């Protein structure tokens with residue numbers, strides 16, 4: 577595994593620590609979130625990000641950060657502001673970008 581893979585694995589570990597319930601661990605299913613796939617055109621989650629690192633699909637830190645932001649933006653689009661998912665998405669978006677510097 578390459579230097580970028582090693583760095584991204586480090587960032588991903590640190591980001592996932594901010595989601596102890598694992599709300600962002602796996603793709604959101606329509607069973608858990610009614611109509612999700614018909615509202616969110618480009619789903620993303622931490623599990624998919626892990627698989628993309630292992631497959632060496634991220635060629636820059638910029639691309640990784642864009643998937644992280646996509647994940648958070650999707651949650652802030654689908655969920656109303658008063659939900660646990662919206663609130664956590666906003667919190668980890670800002671904290672995660674600060675952590676990655």
Ligand SMILES: COc1ccc(-c2cn(C)c(=O)c3cc(C(=O)N4CCN(S(C)(=O)=O)CC4)sc23)cc1OC
Pocket residue numbers: 598599600604608609610651654655656659661
């Ligand atoms: C199995 O554990 C979980 C895994 C995923 C979700 C989940 C993740 N994310 C990121 C979501 O955006 C999300 C939305 C959920 C949902 O069904 N909602 C929240 C938003 N409202 S809304 C549109 O009325 O604001 C509809 C119901 S479940 C879920 C929730 C889980 O249980 C606590």
